[PDB]
Design an enzyme around this catalytic site. Structure first.
Site, short mmCIF file in Angstrom:
data_model
loop_
_atom_site.label_atom_id
_atom_site.label_comp_id
_atom_site.label_asym_id
_atom_site.label_seq_id
_atom_site.Cartn_x
_atom_site.Cartn_y
_atom_site.Cartn_z
N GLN A 1 0.82 -1.17 -0.15
CA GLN A 1 -0.01 -0.05 0.07
C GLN A 1 0.91 1.06 -0.25
OE1 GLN A 1 -3.64 0.73 2.35
NE2 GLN A 1 -2.55 2.45 3.13
N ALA A 2 1.73 1.35 0.96
CA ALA A 2 2.57 2.64 1.17
C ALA A 2 3.37 2.74 -0.25
CB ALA A 2 3.63 2.64 2.48
N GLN B 1 1.08 4.04 -3.07
CA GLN B 1 0.65 5.33 -2.82
C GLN B 1 1.56 6.43 -2.87
OE1 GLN B 1 -3.63 4.91 -0.75
NE2 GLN B 1 -2.14 5.03 0.63
N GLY C 1 4.03 -3.06 7.07
CA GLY C 1 3.28 -4.03 6.36
C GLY C 1 3.77 -5.42 6.21
N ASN D 1 7.46 8.28 9.13
CA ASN D 1 6.10 8.75 9.21
C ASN D 1 5.83 9.74 10.15
OD1 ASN D 1 4.91 7.82 6.70
ND2 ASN D 1 4.06 5.87 7.91
N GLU E 1 27.13 9.71 -7.96
CA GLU E 1 28.21 10.36 -7.16
C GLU E 1 28.28 10.82 -5.99
OE1 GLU E 1 30.35 12.50 -10.48
OE2 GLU E 1 30.40 14.18 -9.44
N1 LIG Z 1 3.80 7.88 3.88
C1 LIG Z 1 2.77 6.73 4.05
N2 LIG Z 1 2.93 5.50 4.81
C2 LIG Z 1 1.97 4.49 4.44
C3 LIG Z 1 0.93 4.58 3.69
N3 LIG Z 1 0.20 3.52 3.49
C4 LIG Z 1 0.91 2.77 4.29
N4 LIG Z 1 1.75 3.42 5.19
C5 LIG Z 1 2.48 2.85 6.48
O1 LIG Z 1 2.71 1.61 6.00
C6 LIG Z 1 2.59 0.47 7.15
C7 LIG Z 1 1.73 -0.50 7.03
O2 LIG Z 1 2.02 -0.80 5.69
P1 LIG Z 1 1.27 -1.16 4.46
O3 LIG Z 1 1.72 -0.55 3.19
O4 LIG Z 1 -0.23 -0.54 4.55
O5 LIG Z 1 1.16 -2.81 4.30
P2 LIG Z 1 1.15 -3.46 2.87
O6 LIG Z 1 2.48 -3.19 2.19
O7 LIG Z 1 -0.06 -3.18 2.37
O8 LIG Z 1 1.02 -5.02 3.70
P3 LIG Z 1 -0.31 -5.83 3.87
O9 LIG Z 1 -1.35 -5.02 3.51
O10 LIG Z 1 -0.22 -6.40 5.24
O11 LIG Z 1 0.02 -7.04 2.85
C8 LIG Z 1 2.01 1.59 8.27
O12 LIG Z 1 3.18 1.90 9.04
C9 LIG Z 1 1.50 2.80 7.67
O13 LIG Z 1 1.72 4.06 8.48
C10 LIG Z 1 1.15 5.95 2.56
O14 LIG Z 1 0.26 6.05 1.74
N5 LIG Z 1 1.97 6.87 2.81
MG LIG Z 2 -2.05 -4.32 1.30
#
Ligand SMILES: Nc1nc2c(ncn2[C@@H]2O[C@H](COP(=O)(O)OP(=O)(O)OP(=O)(O)O)[C@@H](O)[C@H]2O)c(=O)[nH]1
Ligand SMILES: [Mg+2]
Ligand SMILES: Nc1nc2c(ncn2[C@@H]2O[C@H](COP(=O)(O)OP(=O)(O)O)[C@@H](O)[C@H]2O)c(=O)[nH]1
Ligand SMILES: [Ca+2]
Ligand SMILES: [Mg+2]
Lengths: 61, 440, 421
Positions: B11-12, B15, B143, B206, B254
């Site tokens: 997700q992170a 996004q 995650g 974060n 560099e």
């Molecule tokens: N800066 C930022 N942090 C994010 C975002 N989405 C999730 N996080 C952070 O990511 C962490 C959780 O990881 P995720 O990316 O939601 O997990 P995932 O990769 O989707 O893994 P699973 O859903 O468990 O399969 C938490 O610490 C969140 O605060 C985002 O869009 N921006």
């Molecule tokens: Mg996910």
């Protein structure tokens, strides 16, 4: 000698990576199924028990 | 030539990728259908932006990127979003079940089911490159996909691409947005596993980013949308060296030479400026002296830690916009008079400077003001180890009672992997201590 | 995309099952004829977790209605929304509960279990990706408890890597229509500790005490109690049913909430029974707990907390931080960041602002102590064992359940006394 060492160490790094990966997926599939093996065998001593209680209930007359 | 493939994971990662690629198009004049009126090189080219965008005969400029999540929810937004024509469908890869905030699911159980297709699609990107330079892997620490699947992908990428470079943008947990109590577990395991596979990882805290949004932008309660837009501006600065060229430009590799004194010491600390809302930037044009100063205020770091209580092994300044050497030189000099930025004794104390003359831009509807100039400072400092210590302590509190460990053993992991990961981090922490001690 | 299969079983199970469906189908804009009728697309974004797409785009509860007794079926169809339940999912066989856990689990329950397992399969096969299962049921009866726990064991056997989530209602001597329920309850929990991943502990004592002591109802209806259980169950599933920045599913919740597998018994809570400080304080008050336990008599391992309505998310973060800081000794120091909170800006109806609390507290041991105090209260003297040995059972299986449930209270105590140093 130097360039064939840069090659050798890049290759041994790929090698060990390739192996460390394969060995861990094998230890993981084993361990995971052992836990599912263990889980189902538990449930089946419950099935075998659910009948020694039902059969016991026929042993009355 | 010198193409870079971005890989946004979980997700992170995904996004952040929306934020970065939206900003990239705006910086390059790429429209949401991939068309770039500027580029008269139809169907190809070797301009600076082509490091990040392939080209089709239809004039569409296509990210050299790949989004992969184990769950369709968030990539589906890419699929139906504004920028959905940028990508070939096959660059957007989803499974059905996610990793449930579990490293094991992301690295073994679920992730092994899709790793081969992801590689098979990364390969398709590599084979449109004439001089592929390396990968940019965006993922979260916390995650189960961001941790588990990335470190799986990274292992597989070492095997398939040798020592071709892999840089990470890793999202470090903040409890304000932390979605899982096991984030420290995932964080330790992923760091241990990709450590020998990453050449350079830019950690994004974060809480740092969250604090900066509250403070510098009076955002009462920041959202991922708030964070990612600021994050992307930092990522834009670090990759600007790759995507634009000019006389004063200095290729990010560099900087990497200075930034990594030893392979495990490859975690630079980033600081950005100016972060400022339009309301506040109106009638306040910010000199290169002011943004350079702001680099050395710890309020503008991407990781919360105190460089003042560690030692430097490198200081770089990455300037974009209306910025000239003379002004930079002046600003740095007063910084040296007015600041004791102490280095390790094995290390020259120069500041390495680059200037990308293309001025930053903003994504509309943002709260960040559009500034004329910006700077990102990348320093290697032992103080970044505080971020390992904070996580290592949280791991420790739980692991001592084995809290939640059963969710991991249940998927095939052993306690030994936890102890061995935790010890690597123990050793990393003393690496960071050792490099700071004076020579004999 | 991520589907849950629901199962009501026995008297209480099917009635609180019904209100659940009435409450949530209302919230998703689903009329008793299964037609969408709502005002926002947020109502349908995750409708699939609980409903099937049907002929002419009807929405059908992925629900399974189960009982060894007639009456409960004509009441569900005669009740509102009774026609929205598909008719094949009424699985059902008549020789009666007899409030006998023996009949529910082993003898009379085992006949149509293969017939319930049949219909569960038909529903899992259509699941694009089956999260897992949700069981409403009693622990005092005999169908809901005894056959209910038999399903779990059988369902777990076929779907071992699925999440098994139950809402179990614990017997109280007030409200009590029988007297042997302490037996039934600890025979069920001996099962639950082993084969469910998450058990919401719904105490009739706690529920009764709310309507009486708090809400002032000298004679509380079962409809009064279930009005509690309905708003509760809507609370703790708001994360599953609506879009939220945690894409919440049964597994991600279980991971965040269950630090050790046998400690999966949650103390639910709801407020109100209005400002975010007030909502927050009430939600953590012992009086708003749906388990009859005092949380200041133990310690939170983990806590989930969902806020519903139009609020400032900054206030909620300030308030949720407040309660933990001001109450630091009641949250274990060795699970950092163990209080997660979500916000849904769509309230349940009747309320502008509500709060639901899900707690893994070691004070839940008070609830098992009460039951163990009365499970034994027929077992020194060996009372009514004929009701059970008659259906074939052994004495030790009664004592094992006893120890298993005492092993669990002490396990809750052990982690209450654990420190970070
Ligand atoms: N800066 C930022 N942090 C994010 C975002 N989405 C999730 N996080 C952070 O990511 C962490 C959780 O990881 P995720 O990316 O939601 O997990 P995932 O990769 O989707 O893994 P699973 O859903 O468990 O399969 C938490 O610490 C969140 O605060 C985002 O869009 N921006
Ligand atoms: Mg996910
Ligand atoms: N809260 C609540 N409890 C109930 C309801 N119906 C029965 N009970 C409780 O259920 C227990 C008896 O279980 P029951 O479901 O009636 O037995 P079954 O016929 O074998 O399923 C007793 O503790 C009752 O107080 C109900 O609608 N709401
Ligand atoms: Ca002003
Ligand atoms: Mg009955």
């Amino acid at each position: 000698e130097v360039i064939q060492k840069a090659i050798e160490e890049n290759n041994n790094f790929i090698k060990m990576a390739k192996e460390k990966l394969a060995q861990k997926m094998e230890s993981n599939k084993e361990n995971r199924e052992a836990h599912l093996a263990a889980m189902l065998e538990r449930l089946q001593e419950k099935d075998k028990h659910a009948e020694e209680v039902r059969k016991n209930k026929e042993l009355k007359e | 030539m010198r193409e870079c493939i971005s890989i946004h994971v979980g997700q992170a990662g995904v996004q952040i990728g929306n934020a970065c690629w939206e900003l990239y198009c705006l910086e390059h004049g790429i429209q949401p259908d991939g068309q770039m009126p500027s580029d008269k090189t139809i169907g190809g080219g070797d301009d600076s932006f082509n490091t990040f965008f392939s080209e089709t005969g239809a004039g569409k400029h296509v990210p050299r990127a790949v989004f992969v999540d184990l769950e369709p929810t968030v990539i589906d937004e890419v699929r139906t979003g504004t920028y959905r024509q940028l990508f070939h469908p096959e660059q957007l890869i989803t499974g059905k079940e996610d990793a449930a905030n579990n490293y094991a699911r992301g690295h073994y159980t679920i992730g092994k089911e899709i790793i081969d297709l992801v590689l098979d699609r990364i390969r398709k990107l590599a084979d449109q490159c004439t001089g592929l330079q390396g990968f940019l892997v965006f993922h979260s620490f916390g995650g189960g996909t961001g941790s588990g699947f990335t470190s799986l992908l990274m292992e597989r990428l070492s095997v398939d691409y040798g020592k071709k470079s892999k840089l990470e943008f890793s999202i470090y947990p903040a409890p304000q947005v932390s979605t899982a109590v096991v984030e420290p577990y995932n964080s330790i395991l992923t760091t241990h596993t990709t450590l020998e596979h990453s050449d350079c990882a830019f950690m994004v805290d974060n809480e740092a980013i969250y604090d900066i949004c509250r403070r510098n932008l009076d955002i009462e309660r920041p959202t991922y949308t708030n964070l990612n837009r600021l994050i992307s501006q930092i990522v834009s600065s670090i990759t600007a060296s790759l995507r634009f060229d000019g006389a004063l430009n200095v290729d990010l590799t560099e900087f990497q030479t200075n930034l990594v004194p030893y392979p495990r010491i490859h975690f630079p600390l980033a600081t950005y400026a100016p972060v400022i809302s339009a309301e506040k930037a109106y009638h306040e044009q910010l000199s290169v002296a002011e943004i350079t100063n702001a680099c050395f205020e710890p309020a503008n770091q991407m990781v919360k830690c105190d460089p003042r209580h560690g030692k430097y092994m490198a200081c770089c300044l990455l300037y974009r916009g209306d910025v000239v050497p003379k002004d930079v030189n002046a600003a740095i000099a007063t910084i040296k008079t007015k600041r004791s930025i102490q280095f390790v004794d094995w290390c020259p104390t120069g500041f390495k400077v680059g200037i990308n003359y293309q001025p930053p831009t903003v994504v509309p509807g943002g709260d960040l003001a559009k500034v004329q100039r910006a700077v990102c400072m990348l320093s290697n400092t032992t103080a970044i180890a505080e971020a390992w210590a904070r996580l290592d302590h949280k791991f420790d509190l739980m692991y001592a009672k084995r809290a939640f460990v059963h969710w991991y053993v249940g998927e095939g992991m052993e306690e030994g992997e936890f102890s061995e990961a935790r010890e690597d981090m123990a050793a990393l922490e003393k690496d960071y201590e050792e490099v700071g001690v004076d020579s004999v | 995309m991520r589907e849950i299969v629901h199962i009501q079983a026995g008297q209480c199970g099917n009635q609180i099952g019904a209100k659940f469906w009435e409450v949530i189908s209302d919230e998703h804009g689903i009329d008793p004829t299964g037609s969408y009728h709502g005002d926002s697309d947020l109502q349908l974004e995750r409708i699939n977790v609980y409903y099937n797409e049907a002929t002419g785009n009807k929405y059908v509860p992925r629900a399974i209605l189960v009982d060894l007794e007639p009456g409960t079926m004509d009441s569900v169809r005669s009740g509102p929304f009774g026609q929205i339940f598909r008719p094949d999912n009424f699985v059902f066989g008549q020789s009666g509960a007899g409030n006998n856990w023996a009949k529910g689990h082993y003898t009379e329950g085992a006949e149509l279990v293969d017939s319930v397992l049949d219909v569960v399969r038909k529903e899992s096969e259509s699941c694009d990706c089956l999260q897992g299962f949700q069981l409403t049921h009693s622990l005092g009866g005999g169908t809901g408890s005894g056959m209910g726990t038999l399903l779990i064991s059988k369902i777990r056997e076929e779907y071992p890597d699925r999440i098994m989530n139950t809402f179990s209602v614990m017997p109280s001597p007030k409200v009590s229509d029988t007297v042997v329920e302490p037996y039934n309850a600890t025979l069920s929990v001996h099962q639950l500790v082993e084969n469910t991943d998450e058990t919401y502990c719904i105490d009739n004592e706690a529920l009764y005490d709310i309507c009486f002591r708090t809400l002032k109802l000298t004679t509380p209806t079962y409809g009064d109690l279930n009005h509690l259980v309905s708003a509760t169950m809507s609370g703790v599933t708001t994360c599953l049913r609506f879009p939220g920045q945690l894409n919440a599913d049964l597994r991600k919740l279980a991971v965040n909430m269950v630090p050790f597998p046998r400690l999966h018994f949650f103390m639910p809570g709801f407020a109100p029974l209005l400002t975010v400080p007030e909502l927050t304080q009430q939600m953590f008050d012992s009086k708003n707990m749906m388990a009859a336990c005092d949380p200041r008599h133990g310690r939170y391992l983990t806590v989930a907390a969902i806020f519903r309505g139009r609020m400032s998310m900054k206030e909620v973060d300030e308030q949720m931080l407040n309660v933990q800081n001001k109450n630091s000794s009641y949250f274990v120091e060795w699970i950092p960041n163990n209080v997660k909170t979500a916000v849904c800006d769509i309230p349940p109806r009747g309320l502008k602002m509500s709060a639901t609390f899900i707690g893994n507290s070691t004070a839940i041991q008070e609830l098992f102590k009460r039951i163990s105090e009365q499970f034994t209260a027929m077992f020194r003297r060996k009372a009514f064992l004929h009701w059970y040995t008659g259906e074939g059972m052994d004495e030790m299986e009664f004592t094992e359940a006893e120890s298993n449930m005492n092993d669990l209270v002490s396990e809750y105590q052990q982690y209450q006394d654990a420190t970070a140093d």
